[PDB]
Design a protein around this motif. Structure first.
Motif, short mmCIF file in Angstrom:
data_model
loop_
_atom_site.label_atom_id
_atom_site.label_comp_id
_atom_site.label_asym_id
_atom_site.label_seq_id
_atom_site.Cartn_x
_atom_site.Cartn_y
_atom_site.Cartn_z
N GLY A 158 -68.37 13.31 14.07
CA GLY A 158 -68.70 11.89 13.97
C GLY A 158 -67.56 10.87 14.04
N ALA A 159 -66.35 11.28 13.69
CA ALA A 159 -65.22 10.36 13.65
C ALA A 159 -64.80 9.81 15.01
N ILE A 160 -64.27 8.60 15.00
CA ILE A 160 -63.69 8.04 16.20
C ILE A 160 -62.21 7.90 15.95
N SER A 172 -66.01 10.67 8.09
CA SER A 172 -66.14 9.34 8.61
C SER A 172 -67.50 8.79 8.20
N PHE A 173 -67.64 7.48 8.18
CA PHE A 173 -68.89 6.92 7.75
C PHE A 173 -69.90 7.00 8.89
N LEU A 174 -69.48 7.56 10.01
CA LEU A 174 -70.35 7.78 11.14
C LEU A 174 -70.86 9.21 11.23
N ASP A 175 -70.82 9.94 10.13
CA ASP A 175 -71.23 11.33 10.18
C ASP A 175 -72.72 11.48 9.92
N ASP A 176 -73.25 10.81 8.90
CA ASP A 176 -74.69 10.90 8.64
C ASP A 176 -75.54 10.21 9.71
N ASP A 177 -74.92 9.84 10.83
CA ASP A 177 -75.66 9.35 11.99
C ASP A 177 -75.53 10.35 13.15
#
Length: 157
Positions: A1-3, A152-157
């Motif tokens: 998920g991380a960028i 990252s806070f984009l993982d649960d997406d």
RNA sequence: AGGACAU
């Protein structure tokens, strides 16, 4: 998920600010919507710093959620403050906002940053900064190294 | 104190 981009090129004379949020969700809305807003005084500070930049230079925002124990990403300002943007995504208190371009989305723990002491902030660690606390350039580039080096806070997406 | 600081 991380960028995490392969490189970050920092133009000369750029400035760096800690951005704090009381909410991880506002940060996520920032990522998806390409805008951010600070406080009344915080906006004034960022607006003034952004106007003052020599042409190539940028303003980097290092995001950290309150009491989260970490920093969670890096963005650039890509506009000065405007009135014609959709500030309804925050429900209130943030009536103006400016455009941001997200570069890094990744957790970095406070543990890993508590070495960087901020000279103009009574030698306090960068991990103990208020919203729109400015960071010196050479210290900032070291921190940016840590961001490009995994959650990252984009993982649960 | 008309400001989204740490454990």
């Amino acid at each position: 998920g991380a960028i995490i981009p392969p490189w970050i090129h920092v133009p000369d004379h750029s400035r760096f600010f800690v951005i704090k949020s009381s909410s991880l969700e506002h940060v996520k809305k920032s990522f998806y919507n390409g805008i951010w807003s600070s406080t009344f005084y915080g906006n004034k500070r960022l607006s003034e710093a952004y106007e003052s930049l020599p042409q190539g230079a940028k303003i980097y925002l290092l995001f950290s959620v309150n009491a989260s124990g970490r920093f969670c990403g890096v963005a650039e300002m890509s506009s000065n403050l405007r009135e014609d943007l959709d500030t309804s995504i925050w429900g209130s208190r943030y009536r103006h906002a400016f455009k941001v371009r997200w570069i890094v989305v990744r957790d970095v723990h406070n543990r890993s940053l508590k070495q960087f002491l901020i000279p103009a902030n009574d030698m306090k660690p960068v991990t103990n900064s208020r919203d729109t606390q400015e960071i010196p350039a050479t210290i900032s580039k070291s921190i940016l190294k840590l961001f490009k080096y995994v959650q990252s806070f984009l993982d649960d997406d």
